[PDB]
């Protein structure tokens, strides 16, 4: 029986029959296989064609699972993400901010944007979801959504007021010191792109000025470029609070 198991192993338990079981529920199976590290381009081509007649009827949890799965596999199928962005645009009231921040980060990984998608995502975060949902988001996810709107030039000041609520000493403090640097430097470029300087930009600038040794000389120049621009917009002087 040393070879009867090995004969069964080379023909039955193959990656191709792992795919043939995975064809029934692609948003479930591609999400959990890629979570286990199975990020293979040849299988995710077969995932993209199996789910394409089913995308328009997918739920918001299935769309978010499918979009995160194709981000971890790093596979871009433009006809798949067209139907994915047509599902988000048709059901934007049903989507959540926690789900849309994962969908936007996939749409920002490979540059894929529509003007209807940017409007329906901004309407979903600002009006269809709770206004304190960016507080629960995590600042690394909100800075990705800010960069995605800055790169497409889409100015939505109602969205920018909602996303800026998530930046604080709480949410930036939960990040790694290297990860806080990339979050601060990408949120300050997006706030300077639209010319929007909310009151919660004091936490983004203050996260850079309380620890400037992580930042370079040219980075502290563009931080204090935003700091003087927010000082004119908010009408005051920047001061660091010390507890006591």
């Amino acid at each position: 029986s040393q070879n009867l198991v090995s004969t069964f192993a080379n023909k039955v338990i193959v990656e191709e029959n792992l795919v043939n079981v995975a064809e029934i529920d692609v948003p479930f199976w591609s999400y959990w296989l890629s979570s286990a590290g199975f990020t293979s381009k040849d299988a995710f081509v077969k995932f993209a064609e199996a789910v394409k007649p089913k995308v328009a009827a997918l739920s918001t949890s299935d769309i978010t699972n499918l979009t995160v799965a194709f981000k971890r596999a790093n596979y871009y199928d433009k006809d798949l993400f067209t139907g994915i962005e047509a599902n988000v645009s048709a059901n934007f009231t049903k989507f959540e901010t926690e789900q849309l921040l994962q969908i936007v980060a996939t749409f920002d990984a490979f540059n894929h944007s529509s003007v209807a998608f940017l409007d329906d995502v901004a309407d979903s975060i600002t009006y269809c979801n709770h206004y304190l949902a960016p507080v629960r988001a995590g600042a690394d996810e909100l800075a990705t959504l800010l960069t995605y709107y800055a790169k497409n030039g889409h100015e939505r000041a109602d969205l920018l007021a909602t996303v800026a609520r998530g930046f604080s000493e709480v949410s930036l403090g939960k990040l790694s010191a290297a990860q806080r640097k990339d979050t601060v430097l990408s949120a300050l470029k997006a706030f300077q792109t639209f010319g929007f300087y909310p009151e919660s930009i004091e936490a983004v600038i203050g996260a850079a000025l309380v620890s400037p040794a992580e930042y370079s000389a040219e980075e502290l120049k563009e931080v204090e470029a935003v700091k003087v621009a927010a000082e004119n917009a908010l009408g005051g002087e920047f001061v660091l609070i010390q507890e006591g």
Binding site: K11, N17, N20, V21, I24, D25, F28
Partner: protein, 96 residues
């Protein structure tokens, strides 16, 4: 979802996935009706050997016909009376 996939999965296994065709047993076997007779006794022989391999060091409650499993032949596994085999197993268990 969890039930709708499992119905679609087992339907593919019951009908579409056949190991009689994928392994090419038409060369070795005559009929599909004699393959399922060999798959029947093959299922019994595996389930006998798996249930014994799941716990091999046991004294058998079934009567062995004067035969011993491995190189034991005097241990608690081969003892006829079970009251003696319980005392011999307790000495073997504390060492191992």
């Amino acid at each position: 979802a969890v039930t709708s996939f499992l119905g679609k999965a087992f339907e593919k296994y019951f009908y579409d996935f056949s190991a009689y065709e994928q392994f090419g047993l038409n060369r070795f076997l005559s009929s599909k009706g004699q393959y399922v007779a060999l798959r029947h006794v093959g299922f019994v022989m595996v389930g006998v050997n798996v249930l014994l391999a799941a716990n091999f060091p046991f004294n058998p409650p079934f009567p062995t016909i004067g035969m011993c499993p491995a190189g034991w032949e005097g241990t608690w596994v081969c003892q006829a009376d079970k009251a003696k085999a319980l005392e011999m197993y307790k000495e073997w268990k504390k060492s191992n």
